C-alpha cells in the first residue's frame, strides 16, 4: 500500500501566517526566482539566522508544502555565505535551473544505497553463509589495488558458493528501505513519471523492491542460483558507472522522455557518469567531494526532498493551480 501514498503538494494559509507579512514579497517574479530552501519546519527565527550572516534580508516569493516538507521560492542569489549558515541550521536549498518538468514526460533513475551500504549487505550474506573471512580477505586485495571492481565483486561473490539461498531473505528482512522512497515513486507515477534503480547490489532485492514498489525498471548483478543454492557466478553483466548512465540513456529513449527532462540521485563517486548524464543530478546524503560537483544535493531531508525540488519548477512556472 505504500505506492499508494503520494506526497501532497499544496499552498497552506497557516504556512504563510506563521511568518511577519514583511517576509514576503510579490514584486519579484516568480518565473526568474532562482534558489529555494526546504525543510521540515521553517521557522522565522531560521530567517533571521540567515539574514544576520549573509547581511540582507532575505524574502520569499511563495511557500508551499510537499507532504511534511515546507518548501520557500527565494529572493535573490544563493551566495556561499547562504550555503554555509543553511547548513549550520540543517536546511537544504538547491538552484532550480534545468530542473525537469513534472508535467512533461520524465524518468528518475536512482541508486538503491551508497556502495559502502552494499558493501555491508554483502558481508552480512558473507558472514551468514560461513565465509565472512574469504570475502574479508578479498576485499583486501581490492584495496591494495590488486583487483579492479568488476573482479573484486565476482570475487567476492564466488566465495558464497553452495550458499543457501534462504539467506537472502533473511538478509532482505535485516535492512531498512531508503526513507521516502516509496512516496518519491507514487507522487511520480501520479505525474507519470517511469521510475528505474539500477544498483550494484542483487538482483533478488531490487527486483523485490521493484514488486513492492511496482518500479518501472530495475537492475542489478543477477546472482545465479542453482537448487536454491547460490552457485557463485554471476550472470550477465556487472553494474558498473557507466552501466548506469546507460540504463538512464536507453529507457529515455525507451520511455520517450527527453534527456533533459530526467533525473538521477546518487551518493557516490560510483553515480557521477549517471549524474552527469542526466538532466538533473541529484546528490543524496552524498560526500562533500560530490555534493560539489552535482547541480542539486539534498542533505537533511528524505527522499521527499527531490520532490521539494523538482515542485519548484512547477510552482515558479505555474504549471498548475492547487485546489
Given at each position: 500500500l505504500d505506492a499508494l501514498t503520494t506526497l501532497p503538494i499544496k499552498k497552506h494559509t497557516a504556512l504563510l501566517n506563521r511568518?511577519?507579512?514583511?517576509?514576503?514579497?510579490?514584486?519579484?517574479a516568480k518565473k526568474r526566482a532562482s534558489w529555494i530552501v526546504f525543510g521540515h519546519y521553517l521557522t522565522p527565527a531560521q530567517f533571521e539566522d540567515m539574514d544576520f550572516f549573509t547581511n540582507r534580508?532575505?524574502?520569499?516569493l511563495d511557500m508551499w508544502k510537499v507532504g511534511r516538507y515546507e518548501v520557500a521560492l527565494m529572493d535573490g542569489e544563493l551566495t556561499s555565505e547562504h550555503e554555509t549558515i543553511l547548513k549550520a541550521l540543517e536546511l537544504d536549498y538547491a538552484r532550480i535551473q534545468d530542473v525537469p518538468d513534472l508535467t512533461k514526460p520524465g524518468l528518475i533513475v536512482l541508486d538503491m544505497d551508497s556502495t559502502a551500504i552494499q558493501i555491508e549487505c554483502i558481508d552480512e550474506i558473507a558472514k551468514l553463509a560461513g565465509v565472512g573471512e574469504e570475502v574479508a580477505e578479498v576485499t583486501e586485495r581490492a584495496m591494495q589495488g590488486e583487483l579492479d571492481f568488476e573482479q573484486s565483486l565476482r570475487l567476492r561473490v564466488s566465495?558464497?558458493?553452495?550458499?543457501?539461498?534462504q539467506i537472502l531473505s533473511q538478509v532482505r528482512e535485516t535492512l531498512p528501505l531508503m526513507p521516502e522512497l516509496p512516496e518519491l515513486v507514487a507522487t511520480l507515477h501520479a505525474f507519470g513519471w517511469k521510475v528505474a534503480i539500477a544498483s550494484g547490489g542483487f538482483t533478488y532485492f531490487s527486483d523485490y523492491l521493484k514488486e513492492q514498489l511496482s518500479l518501472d525498471y530495475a537492475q542489478s548483478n543477477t546472482l545465479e542460483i542453482v537448487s536454491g543454492k547460490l552457485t557463485g557466478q554471476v550472470l550477465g553483466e556487472v553494474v558498473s558507472a557507466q552501466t548506469k548512465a546507460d540504463i538512464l540513456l536507453t529507457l529515455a529513449q525507451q520511455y520517450d522522455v527527453?534527456?533533459?527532462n530526467t533525473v538521477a540521485v546518487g551518493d557516490g563517486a560510483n553515480d557521477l557518469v549517471m549524474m552527469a548524464a542526466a538532466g538533473l543530478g541529484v546528490a543524496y546524503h552524498a560526500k562533500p567531494k560530490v555534493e560539489a560537483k552535482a547541480q542539486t544535493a539534498v542533505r537533511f531531508?528524505?527522499?521527499g526532498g527531490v520532490v521539494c525540488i523538482l515542485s519548484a519548477a512547477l510552482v515558479a512556472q505555474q504549471k498548475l493551480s492547487w485546489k
Open positions: 511568518f511577519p507579512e514583511t517576509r514576503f514579497v510579490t514584486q519579484l534580508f532575505n524574502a520569499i566465495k558464497l558458493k553452495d550458499a543457501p539461498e527527453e534527456i533533459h531531508a528524505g527522499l
